[PDB]
Design a protein around this nucleic acid. Sequence first.
RNA 1: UACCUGGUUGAUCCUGCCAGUAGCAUAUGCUUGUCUCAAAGAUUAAGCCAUGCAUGUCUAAGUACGCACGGCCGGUACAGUGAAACUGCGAAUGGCUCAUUAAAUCAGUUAUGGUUCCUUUGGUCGCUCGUACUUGGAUAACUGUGGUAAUUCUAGAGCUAAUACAUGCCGACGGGCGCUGACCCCCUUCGCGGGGGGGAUGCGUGCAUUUAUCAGUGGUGACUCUAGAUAACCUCGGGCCGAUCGCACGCCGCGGCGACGACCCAUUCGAACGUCUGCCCUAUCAACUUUCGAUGGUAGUCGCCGUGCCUACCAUGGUGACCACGGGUGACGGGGAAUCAGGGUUCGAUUCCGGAGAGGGAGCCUGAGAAACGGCUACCACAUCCAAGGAAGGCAGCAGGCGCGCAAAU
RNA 2: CUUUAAAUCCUUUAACGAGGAUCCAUUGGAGGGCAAGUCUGGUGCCAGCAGCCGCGGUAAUUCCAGCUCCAAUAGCGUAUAU
RNA 3: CCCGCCUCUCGGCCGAAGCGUUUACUUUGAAAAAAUUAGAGUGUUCAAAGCAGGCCGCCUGGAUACCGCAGCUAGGAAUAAU
RNA 4: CACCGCCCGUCGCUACUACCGAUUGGAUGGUUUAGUGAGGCCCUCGGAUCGGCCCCGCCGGGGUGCCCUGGCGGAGCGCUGA
Lengths: 180, 199, 255
Amino acid sequence: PVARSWVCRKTYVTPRRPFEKSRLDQELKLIGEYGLRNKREVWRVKFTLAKIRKAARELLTLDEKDPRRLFEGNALLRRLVRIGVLDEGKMKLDYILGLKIEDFLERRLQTQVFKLGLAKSIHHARVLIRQRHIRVRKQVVNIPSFIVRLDSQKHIDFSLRSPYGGGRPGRVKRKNAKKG
Amino acid sequence: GISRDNWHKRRKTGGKRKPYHKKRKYELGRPAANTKIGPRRIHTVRVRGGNKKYRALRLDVGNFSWGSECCTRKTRIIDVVYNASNNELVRTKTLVKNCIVLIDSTPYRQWYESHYALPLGRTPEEEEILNKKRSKKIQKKYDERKKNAKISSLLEEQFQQGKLLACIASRPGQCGRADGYVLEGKELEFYLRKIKARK
Amino acid sequence: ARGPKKHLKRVAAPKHWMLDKLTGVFAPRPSTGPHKLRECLPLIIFLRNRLKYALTGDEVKKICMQRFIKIDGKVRTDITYPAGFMDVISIDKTGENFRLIYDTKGRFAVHRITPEEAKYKLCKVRKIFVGTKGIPHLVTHDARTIRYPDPLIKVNDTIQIDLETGKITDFIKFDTGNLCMVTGGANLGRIGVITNRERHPGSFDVVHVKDANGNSFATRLSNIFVIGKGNKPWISLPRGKGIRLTIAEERDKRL
RNA sequence: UACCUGGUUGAUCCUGCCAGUAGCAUAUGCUUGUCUCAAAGAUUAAGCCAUGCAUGUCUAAGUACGCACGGCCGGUACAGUGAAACUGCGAAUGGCUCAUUAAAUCAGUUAUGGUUCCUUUGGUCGCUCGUACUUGGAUAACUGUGGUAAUUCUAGAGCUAAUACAUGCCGACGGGCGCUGACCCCCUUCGCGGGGGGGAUGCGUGCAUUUAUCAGUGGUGACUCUAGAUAACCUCGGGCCGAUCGCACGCCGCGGCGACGACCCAUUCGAACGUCUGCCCUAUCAACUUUCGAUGGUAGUCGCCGUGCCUACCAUGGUGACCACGGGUGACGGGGAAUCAGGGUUCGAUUCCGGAGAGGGAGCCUGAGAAACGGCUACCACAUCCAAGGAAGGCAGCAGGCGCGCAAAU
RNA sequence: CUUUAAAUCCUUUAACGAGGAUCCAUUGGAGGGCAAGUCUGGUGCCAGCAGCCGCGGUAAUUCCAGCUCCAAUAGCGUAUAU
RNA sequence: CCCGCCUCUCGGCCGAAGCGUUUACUUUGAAAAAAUUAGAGUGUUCAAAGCAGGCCGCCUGGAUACCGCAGCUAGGAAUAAU
RNA sequence: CACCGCCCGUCGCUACUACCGAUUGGAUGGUUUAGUGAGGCCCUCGGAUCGGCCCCGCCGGGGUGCCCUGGCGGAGCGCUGA
């Protein structure tokens, strides 16, 4: 008898056919475009889109005025318009199934630091986030997989304690600015 | 100990049953009280619940009731004549519920002489409750209540012998008492037939 | 188990106490008392988690041994004393009074009553019998035994007692047309006016209610607590007034 | 994401299995920078265990004459703090493991109208017509003499208490109601006669217990319920009817606030016994069960209560291919877990519930609650000390070591 | 500092701390199944690899080594239940 | 989609009530331990988790659904047995 | 490998498996017929020892041990209980 919780789940599904060249080709293209580190970072986004599509694929076989459909479809489409991968007009449940896997990779903080002009390449954006430079409305974020919903997409700035922000430049320059 | 559990026996289909627990204290049974006739000796047994169970082992007195006239007085217990379960409970004089005993019946004849005026079961000091000076007004009550005062033959023929046949209606192994009723009516004819045939 | 139990784990506690999972292994077992184990609030829950007058579990004891808290106008030193369904929990150092009333989600609310209102409570009369040279008795649902009742009172009625004395002021008879509250099962907390009772020999009787909105339910007869006469409630009610809104209208009200 | 691929031939189309592929858990190999969570002697041996530890408890309110400390600015029952021992309560919950157990456990369901219930919370506690301004005997702590190699062994001597163990009235208290009715008085005191009205003296009385009648306070689907009346019973191994304790302090005899107490009733935690339905493999288990209990009837004993639970007498039943009965199980049951298109299949010793057991079996004491093992009594089995006269045992509690192991922590 | 019975770990912050950033990422593989050599040296049905088909008898696409590459990546390989 | 023209004892223009061959089926309603599982809300810095939290004393969450079979219930009476 | 094909059996070679096994050979747990049977508990007795009553010397004293408590004494299956 302990005061604990053992509740955990895995968040990726390893593919069945391991060496199919088309699967290796498309996921390596996603790794090289979006600045992911390994294929588990692709499979995790495939798992969250698969869970979303399984929820919509479960709701779509109901009569359209059953109240579970009318409540949970509105909640699921509201979360997808809130994170920004489904646009504001087309909130219908048939438009969940037209989500491509590149929607959730565009809303990561690494891709939204590269697309908002705060880095010179996407790999510079991930190494800028991981070195505690990027903050989102006065919370310093060290997670490159932070999915920026669009009431936080507006506030993306450099840190107040960073050399490319406010001041106090790092140990390389201040050892370098001691010459004598 | 002696256990009265359900699980030491076969099923309704007749197969054996392997036990899944040992004997517990809510399944106990205790050895019997062979209450004999003698001077009064009662132990009390401390039981589950904290209460007392009064274990009579010898008795010579009980509270018996003549039910036809609602007169219940306490009598001696003389002898047992019959038991519907076992003949060894007759020859060893063991008092259990629904045996047939012999009682002393002197306060019943004393109450019959006192409530009514007529004699039963046949000394001028006991004539001084039988025959004495009364007014005419109290004798109007006494001559009223002599109309239903004839008592049936099957009890009155034993009031000549001074022993009424009577049956125990309490349980003398749990409560320590021997209270009961006297046999009358149809039941007296039945049990006189059965003592007549059991010898 | 060779005897009674004395402990109660946290995940086996009632859901309506709204406990955490990680504060500890055990939950407070309610003491034996007037109210049942699944249907009560102890004082340590009511002072520590609902009102936040005391943060840790020793401070609820430091509250209660200073003779501060009255349950039904009596000073209660047990921190796990069960209270529920119009126990009037009265604290006189701050002058507040609380009546334990189910809100419509089914949970015991912090619902405040007037200092003029805390001299009475209601009681559902569960057993009527006679005794001991014809003395009639009356047994309420919080096990108050009252001698010499009004002789029209029958089972499943509601009486109103004075909390100083313990004596019956007036009573409500069980009918259609009285306002009702459920102390019950899946329909716990809904308030409506009674429309029916279907009488079955040998089993639980089902009583159909119609709400202030007009949606209807029915529960078993042992779950029906009459609040008032007519459609007039005799107590202060929670702020939703017992109308169960659905998850759609509750989201729209939170919007 | 409802999926396939190599292998019989010189070559082809197929049945087909092997091998591939992906989860998942147990081990093991090679490896290792950060950080939040987190299983961990189950599998084989429910095998054996050194050592420490795992259950104790004092408030204003049961009993202090231990100077053990200490007030009394000192003269009286005791200031006060209080080690010890008596007393009361808890030790029956928690913990650990899965060995037995296959209509058994267990789960949903329904019942106690067939029973008990320490404690809490409300009811009841001048209802009874019959030394109290407070009663008795001891034994502990303490003092003192010792035994035994050895223990939480205890023996003799001397003290003293009780909410320990006892024994017991007063008051309410004027009476009331039934019984018995010697007597007095009024009837239509006519001639037998005759309807009332008081009543002397004496008897029994309330609740609990046991029986035996008569009647129909409220409720139930349904009582032989609850209540009331009558005649009685009431245990020496004994039923309640207060010999206790603190605070606040008085009013012109009467008192407030409490802790403790108990016959009883209620409901509160439950427990116990029951109903309907549901369990994996096997016919190389198709017939089983027995008058010494297998199914039933009557009367009992016993139990907390219902009943073959048991004894006496009588009846010959009971289950069965709709799989009894017997065997297997690396079988605790369930909530659940891993896979999953729909269906399935397999796993569940494991943190919640329910059961069972503390080496194997029994049998008991106390208690409201036990067949308790951080209680006792033996037998079996294994083990420690010994002055060989005797003494004490139980980690499937937390850590730990032995052993078995592929396999599990300070 | 803060946490906390009292320490620890996490978070905050002051001083040191990166060129080959030696502050050096591994485990299985390269005939097909199955993404990846028609390379250079040895052994010559011996040693061995091989889950299956098979490779090895002096141009080995498979053994033993080097180079290159290619999956997975702070992990992956093997054995058994499923 | 819904009802109507085409049972009876009797209680304040009938709510109330004497009852009719059974069941299988279906649809609602009661009671169904929480934890886990789908699931709503909420920036633990994201996440696995957690039941918190929010605004300059106040406001507000701690929902819900499924839980097969057997039992219970009132609406239906095609298809099936008697 | 394509008749200079393919393949069958007995017997002798090798290592590995199961069988009926001569053996009334051992390891073991169940269920047992019969005989003894520790120990707890119940009954029927038992009665070591301890207390109380009762008999009297202890007290001319409130009455001139005349109820008076003061100290008792020691035999009495006495009289009774634990």
